[PDB]
């Protein structure tokens, strides 16, 4: 499926509410999208885009996003092929300009290179979408949220620069094309249940119950990050912050993994 790149814009605010159909009511979302989330966009129709997070979709006011494009130059000689595969249609020198249109084809880029489109290796271009390094998804969604240390914990938040716990796993999944829903609860509910403590890696993500007057509600969430530590956007200090894991008070609902 052809594809082009979207970055959501919300203008004059952070959000804009998703529908399942082009013909919504438009009082039952789904639930919403926020304000510098990437999508890849389907289409366009009755006033909505149709956009992708991995796995999921959805439809979104064509005011609330911006198609963009990504320019970047080739450290690798690769032939630009018609389709993500290695039929030919032409060829990169050692360094040369040319623009993303789409990413994470199966490992290839979709570009434009002075005039001619078509699909190139990931690892060829010195862009790199993903952003950060990492042996799995899971360790790159940690080296994500290591890079928001310091900001500044607001409710309902989801970045660039402020988060509260939830929105600061959402963000971090969605930088990587992984699609997770908004509430500590739900994402608690959904991913791959790691049952044993022993057995988390970097970039699972952990339920807690914090309110001891109510110990099976789940409102709190944080990203293990390896080393015993887990990083979370926390009301204690009102900052994004390490926290060590052996030595949190508050019980764990579940650990889930949504990397593969």
Same mark, same amino acid.
């Given at each position: 499926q052809t594809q082009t790149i979207g970055?959501?814009? @919300?203008?004059? %605010?952070? #959000?804009?509410?998703?529908?399942? @159909?082009?013909?919504?009511?438009?009082?039952?979302?789904?639930?919403? #999208?926020?304000?510098?989330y990437y999508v890849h966009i389907l289409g366009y129709?009755?006033?909505?885009?149709?956009?992708?997070?991995? %796995?999921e979709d959805c439809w979104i006011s064509k005011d609330?996003?911006?198609?963009?494009?990504?320019?970047?130059?080739?450290?690798?000689?690769?032939?630009?092929?018609?389709?993500?595969?290695? @039929?030919?249609?032409?060829?990169?020198?050692?360094?040369?300009?040319?623009?993303? #249109?789409?990413?994470?084809?199966d490992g290839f880029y979709r570009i434009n290179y002075r005039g001619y489109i078509g699909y190139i290796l990931e690892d060829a271009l010195q862009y790199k979408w993903k952003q950060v390094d990492g042996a799995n998804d899971g360790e790159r969604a940690a080296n994500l949220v290591k890079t928001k240390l310091g900001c500044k914990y607001v409710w309902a938040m989801s970045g660039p620069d402020t988060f509260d716990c939830s929105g600061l796993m959402q963000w971090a999944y969605n930088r990587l094309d992984i699609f997770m829903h908004? %509430?500590?609860?739900?994402?608690?509910?959904?991913?791959? #249940?790691?049952?044993?403590?022993?057995?988390?890696?970097?970039?699972?993500?952990?339920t807690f119950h914090t309110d001891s007057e109510k110990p099976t509600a789940v409102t709190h969430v944080g990203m293990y990050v390896g080393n015993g530590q887990f990083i979370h956007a926390s009301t204690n200090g009102y900052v994004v912050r390490y926290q060590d894991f052996n030595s949190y008070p508050y019980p764990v609902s579940s650990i889930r993994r949504y990397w593969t």
């Open positions: 970055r959501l814009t @919300t203008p004059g %605010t952070n #959000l804009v509410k998703a529908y399942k @159909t082009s013909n919504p009511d438009l009082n039952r979302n789904c639930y919403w #999208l926020y304000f510098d129709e009755n006033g909505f885009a149709h956009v992708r997070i991995g %796995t609330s996003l911006e198609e963009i494009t990504i320019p970047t130059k080739s450290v690798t000689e690769a032939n630009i092929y018609s389709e993500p595969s290695r @039929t030919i249609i032409r060829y990169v020198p050692a360094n040369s300009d040319v623009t993303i #249109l789409d990413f994470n084809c908004r %509430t500590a609860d739900v994402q608690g509910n959904h991913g791959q #249940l790691i049952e044993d403590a022993k057995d988390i890696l970097p970039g699972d993500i952990i």
